[PDB]
Each structure stands twice: as structure tokens, then as C-alpha cells.
């Protein structure tokens, strides 16, 4: 009957079955389609031609009249529309490039773009955002039982010394990305780089149960660090460094501990001011030539810094063990792609 026919919106609503107990039960799937997409008003299976609706009302100065296409002409038009349907369908099929992070199925190390503009049109196009962890935490609730939130840890940096991190939590992953990305721009540390490519000195620290041992390295050494540290180092702009991470591999403690150490380092200019002496550099590729890298801002002292006969430094067995001639692991200093 003509009176039991329902609209397209109501037909797809039921057939798709999105709303219902199935959705909460985690239940490829059918895809909605628009059936008026290619249909032209005035075009029918019979092939009639209606002047002023589906054909020109006047042609070459002649007022057109009603007509019908021949069986051959209509069959062409029907087949042509069938072709146009295939073209549109193919578009959806195409899958295009993205870049994987540390692994193909993980979000870690994936660039998600710059943070959003600021209040007064403050663009952050020079900043890049990287994901460091995506977690699906759960909170038990009486109404919903197990409820899921997406906890995302991201880092941002302009590759020129300024970087920051934040955590964003939401029920939807896309929202957690926005929250973390725009929150992290409010926590920008500035990290001091020696000559723009490395840290000023070795850095050893423990943050909670995570241990980090960074080492200053010469040019061309590259980044030889935890994949997360490589991600953050590129955001900061460090090009050559070594690092080792031990203890717990907690991603938040590693990021908090990394920024803690990198922000509390001491530039050569600072050291000259604290002690009042010149800071001189001796490279083995430049011979005995003394290189003065920082001179005290105020008054140069005349008391030589005390040089003990035997220093009381606390040495790490891991650093010393190598120089003692002990065999390293088979996994050490393997050939790896350029970082």
C-alpha cells in the first residue's frame, strides 16, 4: 500500500540499528547510503522528457513538447548512471598515506599537528605535537558498570629549544588529543643546547623509580636513546646525545624526569659566573689548542680551582664497566637507521 511507506531517514534508522542495546554491547557493518545522490528531478525509468524539468524548455528557438526516449537511448542512460555509481563507490574504497610511529598499530610517536590558535590569533604553526602514550583506563560506575576514558600523553616542541608535555583525558580519543595538545602549550620549558645540537653536560637523575643517564656527545653521533627520548629530543632540537633508561619504564615518569633533568642543567656561561673562572675547552681533533667557551661576566678570579689528587666522585658501574674491558651485550651498538 502507498500508505505504509516510510521516509528514507526512518528506514535507515531502523536498518542501521545504531541506537539500541546492541551499541552498549559492543555491536564489517552496514553502511548508510544516500539514494537521492545521483537522481535528477524529472528522470524516470520510462525515459520521458519533460520540458522545463529534465530537458531544456526551449531548444534552438523552438518551444519543446513532451517526448520519450527510445529503448536504446534509455538503456544507455541507465547504464551510464550505473557507471557513475561505481565511480562514487570507488572513492570510499581508497585508503591513503599516514605515518606510523614506533609501531604500525600504535599511536606512540605519531605527529598530530600543531596546537590550536590562541585567544588573539596566536598561531603555533612552528610547534609540532607527538604522542607518547594512549591508554584506555576504566572507572567503575553504578550506572554504566565499566566506563572507559582515553588518557593521552603528548609532547610539543618547536625544534628550537622550547618543548612541553601534558596529559589529556576524555571519553573520545579525538577529544583527548585536543585536550593534551592545547594543554601542553601552557607548560613550555626552554632547554639549553650546547651549540644547538647537544646537552651542556652529562645528566644522571632518578625520577620516582625511573633512572635516566644522559651523556653529552660530539656532532654526528646521532640520537641513541629510548624511542620516547628520541621523539622528545627532536621536539627540543637535540641532534646528538646518548641516554639509558632503567628501572620502571613508566612513560609519564620518563617524560617528567627527562624535562626535570634537561631544564636543571648548567650552561658554561653560568659555571663561569658561579666560580669566576674561564671555561676552556680541549678537543682531541684540535690538538692542544685551548678554546675559551665562556668568560666570567664580572671579575675574573686569581685563585686556581682546587684540583684534588684523587677525586671523590661517585661513579656509575655501568659507565666504568666498559672502560674496564668487560664484554658488552650482543644488543649494544647495533647498526640502526639514522635518527
Amino acid at each position: 500500500s502507498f500508505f505504509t511507506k516510510l521516509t528514507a531517514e526512518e528506514l535507515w534508522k531502523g536498518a542501521l540499528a545504531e541506537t539500541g542495546a546492541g551499541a552498549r554491547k559492543g555491536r564489517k557493518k552496514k553502511k548508510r547510503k544516500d539514494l537521492n545522490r545521483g537522481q535528477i528531478i524529472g528522470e524516470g525509468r520510462s525515459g520521458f522528457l519533460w520540458p522545463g524539468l529534465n530537458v531544456p524548455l526551449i531548444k534552438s528557438g523552438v518551444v519543446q513538447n513532451i517526448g520519450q526516449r527510445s529503448k536504446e537511448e534509455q538503456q544507455k542512460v541507465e547504464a551510464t548512471m550505473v557507471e557513475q555509481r561505481e565511480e562514487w563507490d570507488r572513492k570510499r574504497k581508497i585508503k591513503v598515506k599516514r605515518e606510523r610511529g614506533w609501531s604500525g598499530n600504535t599511536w606512540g610517536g605519531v605527529s598530530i599537528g600543531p596546537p590550536d590558535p590562541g585567544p588573539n590569533g596566536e598561531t603555533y604553526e612552528d610547534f609540532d605535537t607527538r604522542i607518547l602514550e594512549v591508554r584506555n583506563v576504566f572507572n567503575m560506575t553504578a550506572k554504566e558498570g565499566r566506563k572507559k576514558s582515553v588518557r593521552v600523553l603528548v609532547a610539543v616542541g618547536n625544534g628550537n629549544g622550547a618543548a612541553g608535555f601534558a596529559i589529556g583525558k576524555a571519553a573520545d580519543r579525538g577529544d583527548a588529543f585536543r585536550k593534551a595538545k592545547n594543554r601542553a602549550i601552557h607548560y613550555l620549558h626552554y632547554i639549553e643546547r650546547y651549540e644547538g645540537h647537544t646537552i651542556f653536560h652529562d645528566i644522571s637523575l632518578r625520577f620516582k623509580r625511573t633512572q635516566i643517564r644522559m651523556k653529552k656527545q660530539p656532532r654526528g653521533y646521532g640520537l641513541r636513546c629510548h624511542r620516547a627520548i628520541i621523539t622528545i629530543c627532536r621536539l627540543i632540537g637535540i641532534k646528538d646525545m646518548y641516554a639509558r633508561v632503567t628501572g620502571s619504564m613508566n612513560m609519564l615518569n620518563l617524560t617528567r624526569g627527562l624535562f626535570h633533568g634537561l631544564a636543571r642543567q648548567e650552561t658554561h656561561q653560568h659555571l663561569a659566573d658561579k666560580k669566576g673562572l674561564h671555561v676552556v675547552e680541549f678537543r682531541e681533533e684540535c690538538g692542544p689548542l685551548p678554546i675559551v667557551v665562556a668568560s666570567p661576566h664580572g671579575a675574573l678570579s686569581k685563585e686556581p680551582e682546587p684540583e684534588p689528587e684523587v677525586p671523590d666522585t661517585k661513579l656509575d658501574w655501568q659507565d666504568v664497566k666498559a672502560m674496564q674491558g668487560l664484554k658488552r651485550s650482543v644488543w649494544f651498538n647495533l647498526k640502526r637507521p639514522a635518527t
Binding site: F3, I41, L53
Partner: protein, 132 residues
């Protein structure tokens, strides 16, 4: 819970028109009636026949102006005259509306044996009362 003619809340991104926003209990309070005939007045006959004509006239206009209707049509019966007042989007060219008006009027005048007129008010786009 009552599910009748109620466009339910989403996350503030669902545009709804004035007609859609108001639930059935606001009929005769905040929103009026889409059809106005004398067949439901006391001591009057032919309610069933006026109601059946309305159902068809609404399905006819949806198909005859597919995707061009901004809101539900308003049917006004005076004497034997029928008047259809439809808000229509400006999607189709102007001359096409003149064709569909001439066609839909003549066809419905020879189907119900009454003078039927179509009144079209064109809107640039659907009017949104509120976002729910």
C-alpha cells in the same frame, strides 16, 4: 519514558526547527496545527476523508519536491478550495519550481475534484530554532 514526537537530546550539535523542538503537550499552547479544516468541529462530518487527504497530500509533496522542503507543509481548506503552503529550500532553479507548481496543482485538482493552489515561500536554508 515518553518517546512520541520528541526529538531527543544529543550533545548540542543537532539543529531542530520550532516545530520539532516542541513535544506533543505543547500543541495548542506554543505551536498550532499544521492542517486547518472544519471536520473535527463539533457536529461536523467527514473527518475521516479530510484526514486521509492530508496524509496523501503530505506524501505527494515530499516526493514531488524531493529534498526541497524546509519544513512540514501547512494545509488550509476554505469552502472546497485547498491551499498548500510549503517552505521550500532554494536548491532548484526558478523555472523548475514553476513547472512543479503547474504540474502538482493540476494533478491534485483532477484527483480530488477541488481547486488546489500551491503557495511557496523560499528560504535560503533551514531555519534553526535551537541546537539540542
Amino acid at each position: 519514558k515518553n518517546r512520541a514526537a520528541r526529538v531527543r537530546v544529543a550533545k548540542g550539535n543537532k539543529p531542530v526547527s520550532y516545530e520539532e523542538a516542541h513535544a506533543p503537550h505543547y500543541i495548542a499552547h506554543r505551536k498550532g496545527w499544521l492542517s486547518l479544516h472544519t471536520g473535527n468541529l463539533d457536529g461536523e462530518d467527514h473527518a475521516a476523508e479530510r484526514t486521509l487527504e492530508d496524509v496523501f497530500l503530505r506524501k505527494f509533496m515530499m516526493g514531488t519536491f524531493p529534498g526541497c522542503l524546509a519544513d512540514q507543509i501547512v494545509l488550509k481548506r476554505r469552502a472546497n478550495q485547498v491551499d498548500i503552503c510549503a517552505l521550500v529550500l532554494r536548491q532548484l532553479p526558478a523555472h523548475k519550481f514553476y513547472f512543479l507548481v503547474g504540474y502538482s496543482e493540476t494533478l491534485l485538482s483532477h484527483f480530488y475534484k477541488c481547486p488546489v493552489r500551491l503557495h511557496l515561500q523560499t528560504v535560503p536554508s533551514k531555519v534553526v530554532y535551537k541546537y539540542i
